[PDB]
């Protein structure tokens, strides 16, 4: 009975799943894990995991909330490491992107973002865009988008769109529109 690798550290960011991990000298003995001296109970955003000897903890989408020391142990044997998680900035996967669309038709802009618990906002120049017969918004969880319903030689310009969640750089990508005959 020993750890035959103790828990690692793992630097990441907001807007990533992370796996931490550690190997026992017994096949799949289950351990009991701990955060911040907390039960490490499995819910949902956090899930723990045994191997043939190795040992897991997974957070599903990491919070900079989710930082700090994690332990790993098995009766009188253990190991601890620490998760440092900055707030980056909440960016695209995808980004928009410009789009060519006859008249009578629509335009169907479309992005995907680093973090499940995100929101978005949509542009045409410095105004925002709120649903009236010709934009139209939709959410597919990290997937966002905007139906524009007709595409008159008026209805070209820059578009934007805005991901945003709490205060951590919220980005911003352009997008043109264009009429095609």
Same mark, same amino acid.
Not at 7 to 13: E, F, G, M
């Given at each position: 009975?020993?750890?035959?690798?103790?828990?690692?550290?793992? =630097?990441?960011?907001?807007?990533?799943?992370?796996?931490?991990?550690?190997?026992?000298?017994?096949?799949?003995?289950?351990?009991?894990?701990?955060?911040?001296?907390?039960?490490? +109970?499995?819910?949902?955003?956090? +899930?723990?995991?045994?191997?043939? +000897?190795?040992?897991?903890?997974?957070?599903?989408?990491?919070?900079?909330?989710?930082?700090?020391?994690? =332990?790993?142990?098995?009766?009188?044997?253990?190991?601890?490491?620490?998760?440092? *998680?900055?707030?980056?900035?909440?960016?695209?996967?995808?980004? *928009?992107?410009?789009?060519?669309?006859?008249?009578?038709?629509?335009?169907?802009?479309?992005?995907?973002?680093?973090? &499940?618990?995100?929101?978005? =906002?949509?542009? +045409?120049?410095?105004?925002?865009?709120?649903?009236?017969?010709?934009?139209?918004?939709?959410? &597919?969880?990290?997937?966002?988008?905007? =139906? *524009?319903?007709?595409?008159?030689?008026? &209805?070209?310009?820059?578009?934007?769109?805005?991901?945003?969640?709490?205060?951590?750089?919220?980005?911003?990508?352009?997008?043109?529109?264009?009429?095609?005959?």
């Amino acid at each position: 009975p020993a750890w035959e690798r103790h828990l690692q550290d793992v =630097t990441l960011k907001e807007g990533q799943t992370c796996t931490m991990t550690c190997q026992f000298s017994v096949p799949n003995v289950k351990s009991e894990w701990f955060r911040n001296g907390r039960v490490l +109970k499995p819910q949902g955003r956090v +899930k723990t995991e045994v191997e043939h +000897k190795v040992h897991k903890l997974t957070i599903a989408d990491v919070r900079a909330e989710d930082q700090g020391q994690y =332990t790993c142990k098995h009766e009188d044997l253990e190991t601890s490491a620490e998760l440092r *998680i900055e707030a980056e900035p909440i960016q695209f996967t995808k980004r *928009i992107q410009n789009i060519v669309v006859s008249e009578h038709q629509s335009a169907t802009f479309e992005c995907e973002v680093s973090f &499940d618990d995100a929101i978005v =906002t949509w542009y +045409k120049g410095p105004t925002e865009l709120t649903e009236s017969q010709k934009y139209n918004f939709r959410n &597919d969880g990290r997937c966002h988008y905007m =139906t *524009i319903h007709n595409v008159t030689p008026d &209805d070209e310009g820059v578009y934007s769109v805005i991901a945003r969640l709490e205060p951590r750089g919220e980005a911003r990508s352009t997008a043109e529109l264009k009429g095609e005959l």
